[PDB]
Write an enzyme that holds these catalytic residues in place. Structure first.
Site, PDB file in Angstrom:
ATOM      1  N   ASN A  12      -1.565 -79.664   3.017  1.00  0.00           N
ATOM      2  CA  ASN A  12      -0.202 -79.420   3.481  1.00  0.00           C
ATOM      3  C   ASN A  12       0.039 -80.042   4.853  1.00  0.00           C
ATOM      4  O   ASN A  12       1.145 -80.518   5.141  1.00  0.00           O
ATOM      5  CB  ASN A  12       0.078 -77.921   3.511  1.00  0.00           C
ATOM      6  CG  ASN A  12       1.453 -77.601   4.047  1.00  0.00           C
ATOM      7  OD1 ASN A  12       2.455 -78.118   3.559  1.00  0.00           O
ATOM      8  ND2 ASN A  12       1.510 -76.740   5.052  1.00  0.00           N
TER       9      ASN A  12
ATOM     10  N   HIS B 252      12.126 -75.343  18.907  1.00  0.00           N
ATOM     11  CA  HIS B 252      11.497 -75.011  17.639  1.00  0.00           C
ATOM     12  C   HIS B 252      12.557 -74.778  16.569  1.00  0.00           C
ATOM     13  O   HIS B 252      13.704 -74.439  16.870  1.00  0.00           O
ATOM     14  CB  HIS B 252      10.602 -73.771  17.766  1.00  0.00           C
ATOM     15  CG  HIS B 252       9.412 -73.958  18.661  1.00  0.00           C
ATOM     16  ND1 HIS B 252       8.214 -73.305  18.454  1.00  0.00           N
ATOM     17  CD2 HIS B 252       9.250 -74.694  19.786  1.00  0.00           C
ATOM     18  CE1 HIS B 252       7.358 -73.653  19.397  1.00  0.00           C
ATOM     19  NE2 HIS B 252       7.962 -74.490  20.220  1.00  0.00           N
TER      20      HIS B 252
ATOM     21  N   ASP C 293       8.842 -67.200   9.841  1.00  0.00           N
ATOM     22  CA  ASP C 293       8.521 -65.921   9.216  1.00  0.00           C
ATOM     23  C   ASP C 293       9.740 -65.005   9.203  1.00  0.00           C
ATOM     24  O   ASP C 293      10.522 -64.989  10.159  1.00  0.00           O
ATOM     25  CB  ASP C 293       7.361 -65.221   9.937  1.00  0.00           C
TER      26      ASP C 293
ATOM     27  N   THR D 128      10.552 -71.481  21.629  1.00  0.00           N
ATOM     28  CA  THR D 128      10.514 -70.957  20.273  1.00  0.00           C
ATOM     29  C   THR D 128      11.906 -70.529  19.815  1.00  0.00           C
ATOM     30  O   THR D 128      12.799 -70.249  20.620  1.00  0.00           O
ATOM     31  CB  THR D 128       9.551 -69.775  20.180  1.00  0.00           C
ATOM     32  OG1 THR D 128      10.035 -68.701  20.992  1.00  0.00           O
ATOM     33  CG2 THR D 128       8.173 -70.181  20.655  1.00  0.00           C
ATOM     34  N   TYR D 129      12.085 -70.488  18.495  1.00  0.00           N
ATOM     35  CA  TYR D 129      13.353 -70.108  17.881  1.00  0.00           C
ATOM     36  C   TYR D 129      13.113 -68.969  16.903  1.00  0.00           C
ATOM     37  O   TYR D 129      12.368 -69.131  15.930  1.00  0.00           O
ATOM     38  CB  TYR D 129      14.001 -71.299  17.169  1.00  0.00           C
TER      39      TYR D 129
ATOM     40  N   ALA E 212      -2.034 -69.564   2.656  1.00  0.00           N
ATOM     41  CA  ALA E 212      -2.544 -70.698   1.894  1.00  0.00           C
ATOM     42  C   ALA E 212      -3.473 -70.227   0.783  1.00  0.00           C
ATOM     43  O   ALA E 212      -4.262 -69.294   0.964  1.00  0.00           O
ATOM     44  CB  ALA E 212      -3.280 -71.673   2.811  1.00  0.00           C
TER      45      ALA E 212
ATOM     46  N   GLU F 234       4.747 -74.094  26.537  1.00  0.00           N
ATOM     47  CA  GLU F 234       5.589 -73.445  25.537  1.00  0.00           C
ATOM     48  C   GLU F 234       6.133 -72.133  26.082  1.00  0.00           C
ATOM     49  O   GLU F 234       5.378 -71.322  26.627  1.00  0.00           O
ATOM     50  CB  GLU F 234       4.813 -73.184  24.242  1.00  0.00           C
ATOM     51  CG  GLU F 234       5.616 -72.481  23.164  1.00  0.00           C
ATOM     52  CD  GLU F 234       4.915 -72.501  21.820  1.00  0.00           C
ATOM     53  OE1 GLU F 234       4.745 -71.420  21.218  1.00  0.00           O
ATOM     54  OE2 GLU F 234       4.527 -73.598  21.366  1.00  0.00           O
TER      55      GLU F 234
ATOM     56  N   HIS G 270      -3.880 -70.922   7.484  1.00  0.00           N
ATOM     57  CA  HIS G 270      -2.715 -70.058   7.442  1.00  0.00           C
ATOM     58  C   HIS G 270      -2.966 -68.942   6.431  1.00  0.00           C
ATOM     59  O   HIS G 270      -3.505 -69.199   5.347  1.00  0.00           O
ATOM     60  CB  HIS G 270      -1.471 -70.863   7.063  1.00  0.00           C
ATOM     61  CG  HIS G 270      -0.192 -70.097   7.181  1.00  0.00           C
ATOM     62  ND1 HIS G 270       0.378 -69.436   6.113  1.00  0.00           N
ATOM     63  CD2 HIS G 270       0.635 -69.895   8.233  1.00  0.00           C
ATOM     64  CE1 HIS G 270       1.496 -68.854   6.505  1.00  0.00           C
ATOM     65  NE2 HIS G 270       1.676 -69.117   7.787  1.00  0.00           N
TER      66      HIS G 270
ATOM     67  N   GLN H  73      -2.549 -73.553  15.986  1.00  0.00           N
ATOM     68  CA  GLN H  73      -2.485 -72.141  16.319  1.00  0.00           C
ATOM     69  C   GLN H  73      -3.600 -71.817  17.310  1.00  0.00           C
ATOM     70  O   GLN H  73      -4.635 -72.487  17.350  1.00  0.00           O
ATOM     71  CB  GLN H  73      -2.623 -71.304  15.043  1.00  0.00           C
ATOM     72  CG  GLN H  73      -2.630 -69.794  15.233  1.00  0.00           C
ATOM     73  CD  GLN H  73      -1.284 -69.237  15.656  1.00  0.00           C
ATOM     74  OE1 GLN H  73      -0.820 -69.472  16.773  1.00  0.00           O
ATOM     75  NE2 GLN H  73      -0.651 -68.484  14.764  1.00  0.00           N
TER      76      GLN H  73
HETATM   77  C1  FAD Z   1       2.438 -73.918  17.548  1.00  0.00           C
HETATM   78  C2  FAD Z   1       3.217 -72.942  16.708  1.00  0.00           C
HETATM   79  C3  FAD Z   1       4.539 -72.664  17.035  1.00  0.00           C
HETATM   80  C4  FAD Z   1       5.287 -71.757  16.284  1.00  0.00           C
HETATM   81  N1  FAD Z   1       6.608 -71.522  16.646  1.00  0.00           N
HETATM   82  C5  FAD Z   1       7.300 -70.686  15.924  1.00  0.00           C
HETATM   83  C6  FAD Z   1       8.676 -70.435  16.304  1.00  0.00           C
HETATM   84  O1  FAD Z   1       9.271 -70.945  17.251  1.00  0.00           O
HETATM   85  N2  FAD Z   1       9.321 -69.532  15.487  1.00  0.00           N
HETATM   86  C7  FAD Z   1       8.775 -68.887  14.392  1.00  0.00           C
HETATM   87  O2  FAD Z   1       9.482 -68.102  13.752  1.00  0.00           O
HETATM   88  N3  FAD Z   1       7.479 -69.131  14.042  1.00  0.00           N
HETATM   89  C8  FAD Z   1       6.788 -69.984  14.776  1.00  0.00           C
HETATM   90  N4  FAD Z   1       5.482 -70.229  14.432  1.00  0.00           N
HETATM   91  C9  FAD Z   1       4.928 -69.536  13.261  1.00  0.00           C
HETATM   92  C10 FAD Z   1       5.068 -70.337  11.973  1.00  0.00           C
HETATM   93  O3  FAD Z   1       6.198 -71.208  12.050  1.00  0.00           O
HETATM   94  C11 FAD Z   1       5.268 -69.378  10.799  1.00  0.00           C
HETATM   95  O4  FAD Z   1       4.626 -68.143  11.089  1.00  0.00           O
HETATM   96  C12 FAD Z   1       4.765 -69.875   9.440  1.00  0.00           C
HETATM   97  O5  FAD Z   1       4.009 -68.825   8.835  1.00  0.00           O
HETATM   98  C13 FAD Z   1       3.935 -71.141   9.500  1.00  0.00           C
HETATM   99  O6  FAD Z   1       4.798 -72.263   9.780  1.00  0.00           O
HETATM  100  P1  FAD Z   1       4.521 -73.687   9.175  1.00  0.00           P
HETATM  101  O7  FAD Z   1       5.708 -74.590   9.521  1.00  0.00           O
HETATM  102  O8  FAD Z   1       3.192 -74.211   9.567  1.00  0.00           O
HETATM  103  O9  FAD Z   1       4.560 -73.402   7.609  1.00  0.00           O
HETATM  104  P2  FAD Z   1       4.071 -74.378   6.459  1.00  0.00           P
HETATM  105  O10 FAD Z   1       2.853 -75.108   6.890  1.00  0.00           O
HETATM  106  O11 FAD Z   1       5.267 -75.232   6.043  1.00  0.00           O
HETATM  107  O12 FAD Z   1       3.744 -73.396   5.287  1.00  0.00           O
HETATM  108  C14 FAD Z   1       2.830 -72.297   5.466  1.00  0.00           C
HETATM  109  C15 FAD Z   1       2.054 -72.101   4.190  1.00  0.00           C
HETATM  110  O13 FAD Z   1       2.782 -72.669   3.078  1.00  0.00           O
HETATM  111  C16 FAD Z   1       1.882 -73.366   2.251  1.00  0.00           C
HETATM  112  N5  FAD Z   1       2.617 -74.404   1.530  1.00  0.00           N
HETATM  113  C17 FAD Z   1       3.179 -75.536   2.056  1.00  0.00           C
HETATM  114  N6  FAD Z   1       3.779 -76.299   1.173  1.00  0.00           N
HETATM  115  C18 FAD Z   1       3.600 -75.618  -0.022  1.00  0.00           C
HETATM  116  C19 FAD Z   1       3.999 -75.897  -1.343  1.00  0.00           C
HETATM  117  N7  FAD Z   1       4.693 -76.983  -1.696  1.00  0.00           N
HETATM  118  N8  FAD Z   1       3.657 -75.010  -2.303  1.00  0.00           N
HETATM  119  C20 FAD Z   1       2.964 -73.922  -1.957  1.00  0.00           C
HETATM  120  N9  FAD Z   1       2.534 -73.553  -0.748  1.00  0.00           N
HETATM  121  C21 FAD Z   1       2.885 -74.449   0.182  1.00  0.00           C
HETATM  122  C22 FAD Z   1       0.802 -73.897   3.186  1.00  0.00           C
HETATM  123  O14 FAD Z   1      -0.406 -74.125   2.471  1.00  0.00           O
HETATM  124  C23 FAD Z   1       0.661 -72.735   4.175  1.00  0.00           C
HETATM  125  O15 FAD Z   1      -0.301 -71.782   3.743  1.00  0.00           O
HETATM  126  C24 FAD Z   1       4.698 -71.139  15.171  1.00  0.00           C
HETATM  127  C25 FAD Z   1       3.374 -71.407  14.847  1.00  0.00           C
HETATM  128  C26 FAD Z   1       2.626 -72.306  15.603  1.00  0.00           C
HETATM  129  C27 FAD Z   1       1.194 -72.580  15.226  1.00  0.00           C
END
Ligand code: FAD
Ligand code: FAD
Ligand code: FAD
Ligand code: FAD
Ligand code: FAD
Ligand code: FAD
Lengths: 257, 257, 271, 281, 281, 271
Positions: free
Chosen positions: C145, C76, C103, C53-54, C136, C24, C133, C160
């Site tokens: 989720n 991403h 984020d 990453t994006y 959550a 990555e 997370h 993570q």
């Molecule tokens: C391997 C990896 C790569 C990453 N790459 C990037 C990147 O390129 N760019 C970037 O900006 N960030 C990146 N991140 C960070 C991450 O995308 C964000 O920080 C975000 O906080 C978590 O992303 P997620 O898609 O898992 O979110 P999600 O899992 O979709 O949501 C996070 C939270 O939302 C809650 N949730 C989900 N659905 C619902 C619902 N219907 N109602 C209420 N709560 C709900 C879940 O319980 C969880 O606590 C990465 C993280 C990892 C682990």
């Protein structure tokens, strides 16, 4: 280390053990001569059951009648359509062993195959474990493992089974190494890692079966001693239609006539 | 326990080992037929030496000439007067093995006997250890133990030898149990404690030598694996004029032709 | 304890070549020198894929790798705007996308998996959080989720970064207990800059073990020793993870290549 | 349960402080580019305030370096003394010459001959009251009459006046622990200081292990095959192997460590950092 | 190195204090001379302030004793509840009757039948908020479908609301530790409280172990053969066997102990004294 | 640690009947009731011998045992006065005497062994001190003194009571290193009265381990529990000592028989 081996030995006399033998349909009649000589001597151990490799319909009946032991045949899904239920080693249009247990149950005590080192065709280790659960959730009640030599990898796999809810015992499949060259070919199609120490023990023994029989005992006896200590009371031996090793192993477990 | 056996196996491929065989003057010619068949196959292992039980003067020469291996005879002190120097199993007017080494040295590489579980005639364990030191201080340079099955008791005895100053290695005497009834008689005259787990393994095997051969391997292989791990590079086998076990044990130690 | 490491070490020759790796990277801020140098050194390892990453336009980095390196690349990630982005990615040759919420009216990763699946038959990688997370409501909700993320069309799970291997192994066990049929690929972050990690971990709720902080105190200017300490930590984790059945690994290179290359070499991943 | 064992192994490092003694070993630089590497390594390692540093002796380059170390760094430097090169009369003169220059520790060894060290230890003690470090061989010295005799020889070297023991480098930690348990059985009151050789070069290690009779494990060869041209990766692999050993060793109660630096400082410095031996502690 | 291991095993007892929970188990006195022994044992053991005491239930003598214990000693007394005797409606009434008398802990068991406990635990939780202690079998219950199923059953009993686990008595401590390690693997957050049965009678033990499927070791039989008439020596032998177990158990992190007193107090009192559970601590 | 006790326990069936025991009593002060009762219970154990300490006339106790019990009895002990005492003991049937220097122009045990040997061919038992006799100039001097005691004609070594089994095993090793060809028989004192032991140990320089004092605090009125704790300690010591080669034991009964009888039973010593 001296305390460990002595501890392993005194805890084996504190044994109620079930065994099950596996044979294969012979290729020639010299092999069929060696089989029934081994089938006659093995019957004295009173095993829980015997199995027949996969033609082989004339063995589950013959063993059941010429002898008095309960026989169970292997059955794949190759070239058929709508009790050791196996998917088989395939070709077009496959169905999985679960489909066979679901079908066969409609017509039994079903035995499924388990792979502690993961089936080679599984998408993942998690998928291969889920597939075993639904196989049992389809109606099976006896789990037999592919042969292995890392007893740790078996114990972790066995611990993951109860974690998923599988309430039946994961019977370890013991393969005594009486022909190392054969094992290497078997291992090529089984994806089971052969430990480096096992290959070193058998180099230069391709013509001395007697020493291979003696070395095969120590390996299989050690495994069974460790398996017995952890609560394992079920065993399934891949005899390869030979009886010198399987008889000696069972004797160590108290299985005697 | 699974980690312990796997650790024992991978540390054996990290081996420079010396072996020595022991035979006894046969009683009949069927025994002498079985001996030389075993003597011919064993010669391929190139042992450090061989020994002859105690008549037997026509064996140290015959083995030395019909074969090419170094031979050494046993010699007691029974019924004589002023190189495995032994006091013997007596009668009137005894002298101790030390007196024999002192005498024989005047005429050699002397081998003495050691007893980790104490010689039955010793006044104490301290006296029996002092007697072994002065035997070496008299001129011996090879120590061989009576057979044993508590490897711990051997290791503690071996640790007490270097504590007294004995700078020669205490070679463990390996006796593969190919005839348990024979061992019981041997153990009656040797005062060596037979572990309870060993007797349980051999009950009901008084007519199946093949399984006895397989079970004897596991016990002797386990002992040798533990002994090798602690630094032991010298071994002396009580073959009982049989070769199936001693050959298979040596092979595990890398001793191969 | 001495036998444990020796057992862990002998388990690497009993692995042959069954380990899959994935690297990555992130679009650089300044002059990009360490970024492109690191892709060249890693390209020989034949990884399953690499990712970018994006956070600007990072399509001009996934594009160079796709042709200049021959490696499978994955980027991403309004619903209509994303439809064209996903369509533009697909018609460029991209077969995999790592769909993340991000984020900064939210759009959750679940909805994204639903969207990307509508665009094409993408290979989607979702994020899993063994230490939960931070947003959550509960550990059960964050586990549900992840299930809904996979059931929407995803087929790859990446964790993570973590340092409590126990907490990961328990989490991986709860995934299969819930029915997740895909492997929970651990995300390995070699600690080459503890000050970055401490700040990174504060916003992600990942626990920094006390032994790890003690190993890095007083090293804020000695990069060479951090690399050496990072080797011990990352190899230690990878050794136990491999022995317990994990055969897939995802390295957060942070555009550095010395550690990931050495870690992969321990797993048999070699050119 | 490996993930739990590795975590407790790391928490133990933070359950010790201030008791770890370390010592470094250098060899006489052959060329002049090696002279720069050695004095760079000395300047980096001297901040760790080791118990002493030692200089090997081949067949008086060693004596001048020990002098330069003591005068430019203030560290207690200890030359290695071979009895196979000189006679018992020359050795007494060297012992007097060493002592009058401020040398208070000698690594008394028999020597690599192409007269034993117990006699050399007896000689040194007769001249002056040095601390004498002797060699131990957990895998047994290649020329001993037996494993029993090599252990008595070390016992005699302690009885002769030696007050410090340094082991040949090893890679099976269990056989060091077995050896140390046997030394405690014989009543050897000094601790058996394990010699740590960070594997910065596998081809060179194969030569040392060849001469030294030290068993190279199967897993260690599989980790270095293919790295004969990558020093950066060899160091990262060596850091894992050496840190694992000293973590295990530090768990079993070993508070003394000797490092075969091979005039390099990067590995020894990192390993000492893991053990809590740092400039600010 | 046994002499060193026994010494460190004893020094560890003095490396713990104030965290050891203990619980005692009695049975309903059949005659009236046994009534005196039980209440003598209760008065001796009550000074140890145990977490609770329990009363077994054969086929309402148990309920009256639990009442007498709580009113005359103030100890939390816990009756054992068999589901094989009554129906799900009678059990809810008993559960309500138990709770209204101040009973806050029940040892929910399936029962000795000449309907399982997970159903009984589910029933009790529906009635009121008791603490529920369930049985664990490190050597596997004699009627389980498999060792895998008996471990899931205990897991289901915890999932059903039980917050305390008490094991069948054992004599191979390793198989208890294996069992506890497997319970931690399944995520059972409560500790598996080992049941300790001091062997005050070997002929009676042979009957219990016969019914219970518990393996009697070979060495334990060789210690009691010939002592069938000497209670004084049987206690001295039992004190050695039980103290050794609880010393080993206390070393591995077990801070909870359950004692099968058989209405006798001399052994349980001494074992608790070794664990640091004493009137003045 | 769990395997260690299980290994220690299985070593008792591998012992058969090779253990020799010897009991020790002292002439009572008052009404003697516990003394004679304890000799009757022990007599069934067939000990190698019994002994009676000497501090009044204790010949009328060695005499009763010699005829009333049939057991070999041995009494503890100016040069001319001792010549008649030794001669009177010999002609009474006594074959063994425990020659000790005593506490109160000294006469040392070495001189006594020289004297007793002049009187007859006695079997002499000397005292050994693994934690060093308090008046010895050094541990080496006290070890040399034991050598000279045996070289004067003694043939039996009995140790002062101890509780550090390590210190005993090291001492027993220094005896054979010095050439002592006789076994160093350990003196077992079961702790039935800690207050007595604490006072006894103060005048003998034998170290009371910290774990032993913690086991007995608060038991100055509970004799039953002390007996139970004394069982664990004495059996523990005897278990490790037997496994490491000690097959001779000497019990300081203090005229009590419950503990020694139970200890002997563990060693296979049974009627
Ligand atoms: C391997 C990896 C790569 C990453 N790459 C990037 C990147 O390129 N760019 C970037 O900006 N960030 C990146 N991140 C960070 C991450 O995308 C964000 O920080 C975000 O906080 C978590 O992303 P997620 O898609 O898992 O979110 P999600 O899992 O979709 O949501 C996070 C939270 O939302 C809650 N949730 C989900 N659905 C619902 C619902 N219907 N109602 C209420 N709560 C709900 C879940 O319980 C969880 O606590 C990465 C993280 C990892 C682990
Ligand atoms: C004890 C034993 C005896 C044997 N005897 C014989 C014999 O007599 N003759 C012979 O030819 N072979 C025999 N074999 C070999 C066996 O047939 C092979 O292992 C075979 O390839 C798999 O058999 P199976 O029943 O375990 O297949 P399955 O249980 O069906 O598993 C095979 C694979 O199917 C996958 N799978 C299942 N469902 C799905 C799904 N919905 N989607 C995707 N993937 C899915 C699983 O992940 C798994 O990797 C034996 C094996 C064992 C262990
Ligand atoms: C490897 C091996 C091979 C054997 N081969 C044979 C064989 O071929 N034929 C056969 O008949 N037997 C054989 N034996 C048996 C052996 O002869 C018996 O063990 C014998 O009784 C003792 O022999 P030894 O040389 O060890 O006697 P010794 O070494 O003399 O020891 C015997 C006893 O003498 C005692 N002793 C020594 N000096 C004195 C002293 N000054 N005062 C008092 N006691 C003293 C010692 O305490 C010891 O207990 C063999 C034994 C072994 C271990
Ligand atoms: C930390 C360390 C530093 C070293 N530094 C140097 C150096 O600076 N220069 C160099 O040239 N080499 C050096 N060596 C190599 C070392 O000198 C060789 O291993 C040498 O062959 C043995 O040295 P030693 O002092 O340990 O010998 P010793 O331990 O004194 O004995 C050598 C061997 O002879 C045996 N032996 C002892 N007494 C007798 C006897 N009476 N009869 C028969 N055999 C006997 C011993 O058992 C041993 O096997 C070093 C080795 C180590 C481990
Ligand atoms: C500490 C303790 C106290 C005891 N007190 C008493 C007492 O007061 N009175 C008395 O009479 N007995 C008592 N017993 C004995 C105990 O009740 C017996 O061991 C009984 O046979 C099992 O009780 P259980 O609650 O553990 O049963 P459970 O653990 O509920 O189950 C009994 C058996 O059935 C199996 N099983 C569970 N669910 C199923 C299912 N769905 N299908 C098939 N099999 C299943 C289990 O695996 C187990 O083998 C006690 C035992 C212990 C350990
Ligand atoms: C098993 C046992 C039984 C006992 N029974 C009794 C009993 O019945 N009655 C009783 O009163 N006491 C008894 N004692 C106590 C003991 O006899 C005395 O307390 C005395 O202190 C030690 O006795 P000993 O014979 O060992 O003295 P010794 O060993 O003769 O002397 C004690 C000290 O004198 C030193 N010494 C010896 N020779 C010389 C020398 N030439 N020059 C200088 N110093 C020298 C030794 O180094 C030692 O420190 C017993 C002790 C034991 C261990």
């Amino acid at each position: 280390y001296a305390k460990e081996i002595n501890a392993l030995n005194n805890s084996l006399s504190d044994l109620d053990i079930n065994v099950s033998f596996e044979f294969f349909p012979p290729k020639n009649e010299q092999m069929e001569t060696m089989l029934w000589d081994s089938i006659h001597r093995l019957q004295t151990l009173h095993p829980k059951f015997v199995s027949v490799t996969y033609r082989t319909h004339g063995i589950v009946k013959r063993i059941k009648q010429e002898t008095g032991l309960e026989a169970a045949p292997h059955l794949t899904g190759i070239d058929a359509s709508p009790i050791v239920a196996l998917r088989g080693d395939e070709e077009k249009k496959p169905f999985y062993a679960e489909d066979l247990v679901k079908l066969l149950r409609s017509v039994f005590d079903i035995s499924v195959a388990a792979y502690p080192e993961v089936h080679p065709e599984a998408k993942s280790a998690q998928a291969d474990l889920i597939n075993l659960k639904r196989k049992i959730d389809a109606g099976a009640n006896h789990v037999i493992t592919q042969f292995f030599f890392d007893v740790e990898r078996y114990l972790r796999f066995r611990d993951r089974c109860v974690m998923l809810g599988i309430d039946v015992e994961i019977v370890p499949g013991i393969l005594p190494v009486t022909n190392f060259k054969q094992l290497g070919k078997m291992a090529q199609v089984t994806n089971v890692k052969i430990p480096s120490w096992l290959s070193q023990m058998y180099e230069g023994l391709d013509d001395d079966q007697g020493t291979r029989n003696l070395v095969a005992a120590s390996i299989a006896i050690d495994m069974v001693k460790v398996l017995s200590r952890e609560g394992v009371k079920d065993f399934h031996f891949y005899t390869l239609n030979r009886s010198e090793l399987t008889y000696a192993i069972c004797h160590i477990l108290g299985v005697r006539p």
